[PDB]
RNA sequence: GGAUUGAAACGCCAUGCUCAGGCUGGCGAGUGGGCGCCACUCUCCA
């Protein structure tokens, strides 16, 4: 039992997306006291459409920044975003509690994978 | 299903001789964000004949049911109120239908705008069917 | 300890998760009134699918609280959380009286293991 | 095709665990703390 690239359930996809935004941010800005996780974990799971919209602004800004320097990862992450955001039809305003459980699994699963290598 | 919650409390002062010597004490509260409840009841005439329970008492009972909560406010109680009341009256001293059939005429379900967690009465839809010939349904109470 | 780290039985896993959570919380906040167990044991068993996702919020907050300090155990816990959860495909809705018993077992074995030096 | 102190031999009919009772009254997570000091996109060809 591990990460399934084919689950195609919306709250699972949202969890994966969250996890990889965390990872990309990490590489963006070293040395931060607090991660986006610590800041937004709860909110994200309660109000998808609310926040998700917001975060992508900053992510855009960052990837804009990061092309100057020769270093890359971040093109793999931009592709990973672009896959998950194409599979997600739309952003729910809110999720049933039981669904907020499944969101945690997609996050953890995805994280572990990225934890490797 | 319901999901109970718990919260924490400070305190100015100390009740007892706590000489160990700010926020001096903790405390707890238990709450329910939201919930909707149902109940059932019966009345029997043969037993009533044995005690004299009469009509005026029945009217007073209806009134008590309607206005029960209004005088109950307390710290822990929160906000509570009654919403609906339906009464079935058979046409003879012994009913004309089984009870379970009658209670089935009332049905409760989610409104169209389900939207995940329920937080108001508005989230629900209530409907009542039509009773057999021998039973009289009055719901406007 | 009798703990079997390769059982993979869902209720067993769940119990281990519970125990680890408890330990984390305990470490976070010395001098607390009571334990997680005391507050949420019942509910968990009753409805695993509704409570675990709330528990994991607080877990994060505790970890955050901890890690900033030299007592960076709390990183070690997070790895276990990763490992455990990894094996789980979804949360159950309901549990039989039987797996409830199993659930308990897992809890206890893990508890003793943590308390080992 | 006389005779195992044997050959035959019911434990049986039937009986409410019952009437009823609040987990209650109420309590601040709060006083305040600089992300700072300084750094060339620069040296060629009608």
Automatic annotation (TrEMBL), chains A, C:
It comes from the Bacteria. Coiled coil: none annotated. This is CRISPR-associated protein, CT1133 family. The lineage of its organism: Bacteria, Pseudomonadati, Thermodesulfobacteriota, Desulfovibrionia, Desulfovibrionales.
Automatic annotation (TrEMBL), chain B:
It comes from the Bacteria. Transmembrane segments: none annotated. The chain holds residues 146 to 290 of 290 of the full protein. This is CRISPR-associated protein, TM1801 family.
């Amino acid at each position: 039992v591990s990460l399934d690239p084919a689950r195609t359930d919306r709250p699972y996809l949202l969890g994966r997306l969250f996890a990889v935004l965390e990872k990309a941010q990490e590489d963006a800005v070293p040395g931060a006291n607090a991660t986006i996780k610590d800041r937004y974990l709860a909110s994200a799971s309660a109000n998808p459409g609310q926040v998700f919209h917001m975060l992508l602004k900053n992510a855009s800004n960052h990837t804009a920044k990061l092309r100057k320097d020769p270093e890359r990862k971040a093109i793999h992450y931009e592709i990973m975003m672009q896959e998950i955001i194409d599979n997600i039809s739309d952003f729910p305003v809110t999720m049933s509690s039981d669904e907020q459980g499944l969101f945690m699994i997609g996050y953890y699963h995805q994280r572990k994978a990225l934890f490797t290598k | 299903p319901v999901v109970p919650q718990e919260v924490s409390i400070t305190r100015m002062a100390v009740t007892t001789k706590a000489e160990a010597e700010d926020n001096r004490t903790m405390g707890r509260k238990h709450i329910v964000p939201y919930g909707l409840y149902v109940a059932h009841g019966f009345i029997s005439a043969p037993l009533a004949e044995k005690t004299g329970f009469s009509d005026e008492d029945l009217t007073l009972f209806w009134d008590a049911l309607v206005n029960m909560f209004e005088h109950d406010r307390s710290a822990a109680r929160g906000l509570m109120s009654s919403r609906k009341l339906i009464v079935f009256k058979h046409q003879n001293r012994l009913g004309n239908a089984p009870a379970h059939k009658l209670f089935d005429l009332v049905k409760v379900s989610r409104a169209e705008g389900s939207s995940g967690p329920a937080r108001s009465f508005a989230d629900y839809a209530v409907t009542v069917g039509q009773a057999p010939e021998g039973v009289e349904v009055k719901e406007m109470l």
